[model samples]
Target: QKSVADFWFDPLCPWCWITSRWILEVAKVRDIEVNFHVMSLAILNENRREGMARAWGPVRVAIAAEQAHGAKVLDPLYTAMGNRIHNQGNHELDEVITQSLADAGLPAELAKAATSDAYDNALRKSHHAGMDAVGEDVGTPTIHVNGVAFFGPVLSKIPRGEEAGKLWDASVTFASYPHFFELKRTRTEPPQF
Candidate 1:
């Protein structure tokens, strides 16, 4: 049987993007189905020097697109948005949004969500679903596996083929164990996408 994994992401985060790709790789070799949700670094770090406004556009589009279409469009739109933002270093550009909309075969006007708060309620609902599952303290890319929730593995690069499958096996095994809280280490290098 395929196991459902709830995944949350914000397009602005490179680490989340890398981890998302790794999970996709895992799905290729394992009976894992990922349910993607929206979260925002802007909202998470709203009190910091970087205000919440910066995070609003991309996530708003994400929610708007998902609302207009369905869940399946998320991966394609995210892939397009991420490749431009994370890989190419573009932020909240209308061109990127339009291009990603086109890439996903979505209506180009859905990009208007970036400028308006029409879908803010939906975005907040999507964001809270993840926060409620993981917690308010965690940042983006929270994963829920087998009724257990955790922050992340935060890999430096995407694991591939059998290696990716092995990681998923171990993660699920450890997460399944009672009282297993966290396993972490210092980051030595930036996340590689």
Candidate 2:
């Protein structure tokens, strides 16, 4: 039960933006321990400016706020970020994004940190350590539950796409209710029946 949820993402990556909503929901009601590590997707490909600029926009703001304030400060920014993508479909170079972060109370100076090699370096290194924990690349929207890595909603056998909701439900159930599959555990007692 003592574990952290390592989330890998870049704010500007559209798919990451999409998957981030589900991840946000997971953070909301789950009873297990949680730790939010900001992984930079900008590291993955050749387009550093495009990727890095995207990550820098709101994420750098959020990360700086998290560093200066704490992770919970992200709650509002998370909502605002979703609003930018889901509600407005304004993925890139939209002033509303800047306004949205400002509305979320993040300053422009911090938000632009994604473009700064110094700040981005620190954030990348922190997230890289988490990726190292699972021994792989820090792909966007990747989740490491107790250092075990999973991607693209395949943590369970329920498939991806529209079935993600069910798959995620199954994953949480499987994590908590292992006896349903008769998997024995030498580490701890079963939950009360």
Candidate 3:
């Protein structure tokens, strides 16, 4: 049987980028389907005076792509956005949005969703779906599998091949067990983007 999971992300998060790659790699070796959702780091941080300045652009574009096209565009759109920001060290400029649209095989006009008020409702709905799954306190890259939700495993780099599958197996097993919750260790390294 195929396993299905939902992964929430904001383009600004390096940890999300790494974990997203790991999830993709896992799909290569396992029967798993991952649905990616737009979870705004900007919205999550809005009340703290961190503001919605940086996160608004890419996430809006993500929702707009889905709204205009469909969910089929999400993984590619996320890959495009994450590749530019995480891999190429680029900012979320209009040009970046254009390139990301092109990368996802979406039209140039869709990039306007970045600045459009029309997409705010869809964006909020996607953001709230993630928040509802993992609760309000947790941040991006929240994963929900088999009716279990958690913050992260917070890897230093993308795990490849069977290692990714193994980690997924262990995570589900532990997360589903009764009275098993809250594992922790001090970070040994900053996220390796």
Candidate 4:
């Protein structure tokens, strides 16, 4: 049986970008289909939301695309934006967002949602669908599978090929085990985006 991997992310976060890549690799090596959803740092960090205000743009466009089109639009849209922002270090939001839409075969008009709150409710709902599963304290790249949910197996360096499959193997084990919770270490190195 093919498993549906419910993945939540914010396009602005490098960690989520790497995690998203890892899961796409996992899909290649495992019988799983990734279903991407939007979760905002702006919503999660609302208590200290000053700097995160800019984060709203990308994720809002993600939601607007998903709302206007469908969930399938997210993988391509997220990938297009993630590559530009994280891989290419392009911080020009207007160009990056509009270009990413074109890259994803979406119209340029969805770019306007970046500056509007029109989709915040839909964005919040998609965000909450994943966040609510793992609880509020954790942030994005939250993922769920086989009736289990967790925030991340947050990685600095991404795994590829069968190594990615092995990590998914371990992750599935952790997911189904009722007693297992939380793993950690400090990030001494920057994300290898």
Considering every candidate listed, which one attains the maximal lDDT?
4
Worst 10 residues of 4 by lDDT: 46-55
Tens-digit per-residue lDDT, 1-193, candidate 4: 5766788888888888888899999888898988898998888788432233477889999999999999999999999998988898888777779999999999899999999999899988887777874344766667887667887877887899999999998988887789998766766644544
Per-residue lDDT for 1-193 in model 3, tens only? 5677788887778888988898898898888888898888778776441222445788888888888888878999999988988798787456668898898889888877878778888888888877764334766567877667777777778899999999989887876796887787766645434
lDDT of 1 at 7: 80
Segments of candidate 2 deviating more than 4 angstroms: 1-4, 26-34, 46-55, 92-97, 112-115, 133-138, 154-166, 173-193
TM-score of 2: 0.62
Residue-by-residue lDDT tens digits, candidate 1, 1-193: 5677778888777778888999999989998888888887777765331222456788899998888889778888899998988787766467778888898888888988998999888887887777654334766567788667777876778899889999989889877798887777666644434
Q: Ranking by lDDT, best first?
A: 4, 1, 3, 2
C-alpha lDDT values of all predictions: 0.80, 0.55, 0.79, 0.84
Give the TM-scores of the predictions, in the order they appear: 0.87, 0.62, 0.89, 0.89
Query: On a 0 to 100 scale, what is the lDDT of residue 132 in model 1?
Result: 58
Candidate 2 C-alpha lDDT tens digits along 3-83: 455566555555545555555555454544545556655455542233235545555655676777777666566667657
lDDT, candidate 1, residue 103?
A: 89
In candidate 2 the C-alpha lDDT for residue 166 amounts to 50
Worst-scoring 10-residue span by lDDT in model 2: 153-162
Candidate 4 Cα outliers beyond 4 Å, as residue runs: 48-53, 133-136, 185-193
lDDT of candidate 4 vs native? Answer: 0.84
Candidate 3: stretches off by over 4 Å = 49-53, 133-136, 187-193
Worst 10 residues of 1 by lDDT: 46-55
